[PDB]
């Protein structure tokens, strides 16, 4: 699939050292909702590849990574836009479609950033 694998190890280099919108998952491989989103969240990473980055991170196993991002319920979908230090909480539907959209919205205030 399109979408990234992030780890404690990889996070900085990939998302924090990036100029490109970053969505990211954070998961645990149990969680219902997280399966559902699974696929949907694959059509997005492919519907969205080479324009936006995408993501998931195990936060049942890199529970450190999933606690530095104040993560509590699963799934938790963090945007990571101009200032990689300050990622928004994504909140919308859980389908391909609602994220592309959301997608778009964060990277056009992304490409604002850099024009401006």
């Given at each position: 699939?399109?979408?990234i694998?992030?780890?404690?190890?990889?996070?900085?280099?990939?998302?924090?050292q990036?100029?490109?919108?970053?969505?990211?998952?954070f998961?645990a491989?149990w969680?219902?909702?997280?399966?559902?989103?699974?696929?949907?969240?694959?059509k997005?990473?492919?519907?969205?590849?080479?324009?936006v980055?995408?993501?998931?991170?195990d936060?049942?196993?890199?529970?450190?990574?999933?606690?530095?991002?104040?993560?509590?319920?699963?799934?938790?979908?963090?945007?990571?836009?101009?200032?990689?230090?300050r990622?928004?909480?994504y909140?919308?539907?859980?389908?391909?479609e609602?994220?592309?959209?959301?997608?778009?919205?964060?990277l056009?205030?992304?490409?604002?950033?850099?024009?401006?």
């Amino acid at each position: 699939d399109d979408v990234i694998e992030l780890t404690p190890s990889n996070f900085n280099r990939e998302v924090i050292q990036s100029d490109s919108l970053w969505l990211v998952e954070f998961y645990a491989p149990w969680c219902g909702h997280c399966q559902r989103l699974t696929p949907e969240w694959k059509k997005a990473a492919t519907a969205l590849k080479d324009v936006v980055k995408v993501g998931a991170v195990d936060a049942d196993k890199h529970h450190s990574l999933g606690g530095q991002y104040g993560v509590q319920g699963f799934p938790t979908i963090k945007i990571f836009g101009s200032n990689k230090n300050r990622p928004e909480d994504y909140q919308g539907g859980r389908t391909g479609e609602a994220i592309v959209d959301a997608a778009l919205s964060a990277l056009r205030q992304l490409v604002k950033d850099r024009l401006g």
